[PDB]
Design a protein around this ligand. Structure first.
Ligand SMILES: CSc1nccc(-c2ccc3nc(NC(C)=O)sc3c2)n1
Length: 795
């Protein structure tokens, strides 16, 4: 029967049928709309390849990795087991006749027409110098992917009737098109009582014909302080102007939440509003080019826009110009939007333009409501490969918040690519689910998209998702209860022990942050409760796969009290930073541990094996000491090779974070939050948690062979890597600025904050300046030594 809709609801965390919180039928129309994209991708997909999900690339194997193929040969261990020699560009389809190739312990298969070098797992191994273990296996049944069978010249105007609260005031109405205010009207102020009626007409100056699709009536209540906001889409999803009586429950108090077409579902408590609807000169060329060259966050003066619009067609031959050219369109004029479209009809240079993800992203941000503009960005995304889509997904998802309508190219794109690849499909799930679970502002839209995906991923995936949700809700329950019962107490660990007995009577589940890894039974004697302020559960599980090479059990932390959505975003940008460096033969040894937000200030975390905190390494002797980090680093490594590798790994990873963590503006971190692996790899944790640009303390320096006033061949390497790392990122200024900007608009608590990255990336500066800029930032750190780290102790 429809019991299927109940399980969907439970998977999704929201009931998409529930037609309570709607004043029109856009969500339903979208549920209906997304059926054919769902069905088309399901039909188009190859059952074999879809069943095995080969993680693959096209990108040229980086040089530093070819240095670990100094023989033109690669060792593979097939499983009693035997080693085999294989050429870099041999097919797994070929080396089978060398007498289905599945990775040991993992749900990862090596299949299809591509060199073995083009498989991510192979590239993962070479990076680490670990022998490729592959079980000789027969492919899983594609049958388990079974999908269940299913001309107006009048001026626009609005009647503000009044507002109502259950438990000095004026309404403001704005006709908005993507952050542009096309027109603005106010009501007369009135004493602020529970019910305040105006029954006024507000007549705008923008004529009805001049309303563009995607235009919001944004209603705001002021006391002067903004108190409550609400939005209604003036032109609706069927292409019809808004009409009729409307009662909208408003949100209580810049971020993506202010743009939503959703209404406050809390009717018991919320404020509501009743409304009623019934060829050029050298120099101008030089000025134009200087406009197009400016970073994405550099404001256009009115002189700029009139210029850009005038040389419209000449501006079109530059893709870098597109965000700027479409930010100069007067969307509140019918004749102009028309011209804009004759122009978009001949966007031929952009179609042939090599795909610029950074450029692409801009046309999807808060500043473009036109869906035809937004579509040309989505058009470029069509050519991205899976590996690429996986780098951008979290932020492509977040960009759905900026779409004016629930059904768009973007939402359809994420749907297609999720339906076409289990791994993308896996992450898409948890991303959407995380947003559905915690944003009242966007759950309705995100829930609809997630239904649309779950009704097409097939029964296997469906049952996969079932186990994970069951498990994470089971464990979440436990996570909160313990925080209620609290440094670490005595009963607490026994109380925990006893709770973990109750919830093992689902027996296997995919780790949400690494879908390749099966988590079997818990290891109940290994589970603890950490001594940090928020009392998170240290939990580990035995791997479900018997075909695993070892018994290194999977560790996952469960935490409530911090915004892991923020962690998630930072980490994604970290993976994008590695991705730039990789294309410039740079491995900065970033360790961006796996992490998913599952609810409100609550989620999960990848435990990185063989690592501790630098604060813990200091604790081991408030009176800090210089030597103990190098001392600790030695007493872990047996051989001199390993220690020399470890110290190098430190020099790269430290440079890596110093660059990353500086550019993102999260440099000034406490001791507790930086961690190092015994293998030398350093990494930061907790992003939901007299200044300094980045942590580079005298114990860090001591390891490089430096204290106070000194330098070493290993330290001069550090600066060499930094600078090179620093101007690598700078080559992708436009990309970074967008990602940063979108991360704030969709993930954090202002115009000011958005521009740290402009100062951090030093826009307008030449190359040799930036060299010196970062080198002097290194210098600043040497001075403060332990004063700032001591601050965080006092704090
Ligand atoms: C507690 S709060 C927190 N918040 C964000 C992130 C984290 C985190 C991440 C990774 C991580 N790896 C660890 N490895 C070992 C061996 O202990 S511990 C740890 C902790 N913790």
């Amino acid at each position: 029967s429809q019991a299927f809709q109940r399980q969907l609801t439970a998977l999704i965390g929201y009931d998409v049928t529930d037609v309570s919180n709607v004043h029109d039928d856009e969500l339903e129309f979208t549920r209906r709309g997304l059926v054919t994209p769902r069905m088309a991708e399901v039909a188009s997909r190859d059952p074999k390849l879809y069943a095995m999900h080969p993680w693959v690339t096209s990108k040229p194997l980086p040089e530093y990795l070819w240095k670990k193929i100094a023989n033109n040969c690669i060792f593979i261990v097939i499983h009693t087991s035997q080693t085999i020699k294989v050429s870099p560009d041999d097919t797994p389809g070929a080396i089978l006749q060398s007498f289905v190739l599945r990775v040991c312990g993992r749900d990862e298969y090596l299949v299809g027409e591509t060199p073995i070098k083009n498989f991510q797992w192979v590239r993962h191994c070479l990076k680490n110098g670990e022998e490729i273990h592959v079980v000789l296996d027969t492919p899983p049944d594609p049958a388990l992917d079974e999908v269940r069978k299913e001309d107006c010249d009048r001026k626009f105007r609005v009647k503000i009737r009044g507002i109502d609260i259950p438990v000095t005031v004026f309404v403001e109405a704005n006709i908005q098109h993507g952050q542009q205010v096309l027109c603005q009207r106010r009501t007369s102020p009135k004493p602020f009582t529970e019910e305040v009626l105006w029954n006024v007409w507000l007549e705008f100056s923008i004529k009805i014909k001049d309303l563009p699709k995607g235009a919001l009536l944004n209603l705001q209540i002021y006391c002067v302080q903004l108190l409550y906001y609400v939005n209604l889409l003036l032109i609706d999803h069927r292409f019809l102007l808004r009409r009729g009586e409307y009662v909208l429950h408003m949100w209580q108090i810049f971020n993506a939440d202010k743009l939503t077409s959703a209404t406050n579902p809390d009717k018991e408590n919320s404020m509501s509003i009743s409304i009623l609807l019934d060829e050029m000169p050298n120099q101008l060329r030089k000025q134009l080019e200087a406009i197009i060259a400016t970073d994405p966050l550099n404001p256009l003066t009115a002189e700029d826009k009139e210029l850009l619009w005038h040389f419209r067609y000449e501006s079109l031959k530059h893709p870098k110009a597109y965000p700027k050219l479409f930010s100069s369109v007067k969307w509140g004029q019918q004749e102009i939007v028309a011209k804009t479209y004759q122009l978009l009809a001949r966007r031929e240079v952009w179609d042939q333009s090599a795909l610029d993800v950074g450029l692409t992203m801009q046309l999807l941000d808060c500043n473009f409501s036109d869906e035809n503009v937004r579509a040309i960005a989505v058009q470029k995304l069509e050519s991205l490969e899976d590996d690429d889509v996986l780098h951008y997904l979290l932020q492509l998802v977040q960009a759905v918040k900026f779409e004016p309508y629930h059904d768009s190219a973007l939402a359809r794109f994420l749907l297609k690519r999720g339906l076409r690849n289990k791994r993308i499909g896996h992450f898409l799930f948890w991303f959407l689910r995380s947003e559905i679970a915690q944003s009242r502002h966007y759950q309705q839209r995100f829930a609809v998209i997630l239904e649309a995906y779950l009704r097409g991923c097939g029964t296997a995936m469906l049952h996969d998702f079932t186990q994970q949700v069951q498990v994470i809700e089971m464990l979440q329950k436990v996570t909160l209860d313990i925080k209620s019962l609290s440094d670490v107490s005595s009963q607490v660990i026994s109380q925990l022990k006893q709770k973990l007995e109750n919830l093992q009577n689902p027996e296997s589940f995919r780790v949400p942050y690494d879908p390749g890894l099966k988590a079997g039974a818990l290891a109940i004697e290994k589970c603890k409760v950490m001594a940090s302020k928020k009392k998170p559960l240290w939990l580990e599980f035995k791997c479900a796969d018997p075909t695993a090479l070892s018994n290194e059990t999977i560790g996952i932390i469960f935490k409530h009290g911090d915004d892991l959505r923020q962690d998630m975003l930072i980490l994604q940008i970290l993976r994008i930073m590695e991705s730039i460096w990789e294309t410039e033969s740079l491995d900065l040894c970033l360790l961006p541990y796996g992490c998913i937000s599952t609810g409100d200030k609550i989620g999960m975390i990848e435990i990185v094996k063989d690592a501790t905190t630098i604060a813990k390494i200091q604790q081991s002797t408030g009176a800090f000491k210089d030597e103990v980090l190098n001392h600790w680093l030695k007493e872990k490594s047996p051989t001199e090779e390993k220690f020399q590798a470890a110290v190098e790994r430190f020099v790269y990873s430290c440079a890596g974070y110093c660059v990353a963590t500086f550019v993102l503006g999260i440099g000034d971190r406490h001791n507790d939050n930086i961690m190092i692996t015994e293998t030398g790899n350093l990494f930061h944790i907790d992003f939901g948690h007299e200044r300094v640009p980045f942590v580079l303390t005298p114990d860090f320096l001591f390891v490089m062979g430096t204290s106070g006033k000194k330098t070493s061949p290993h330290f001069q390497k550090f600066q060499d890597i930094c600078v090179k790392a620093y101007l690598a990122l700078r080559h992708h200024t436009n990309l970074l600025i967008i990602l940063f900007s979108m991360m704030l608009m969709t993930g954090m608590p202002s115009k000011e904050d958005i521009e740290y990255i402009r100062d951090a990336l030093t826009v307008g500066k030449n190359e040799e300046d930036a060299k010196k800029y970062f080198l002097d930032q290194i210098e600043v750190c040497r001075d403060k030594g332990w004063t700032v780290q001591f601050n965080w102790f006092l704090h």
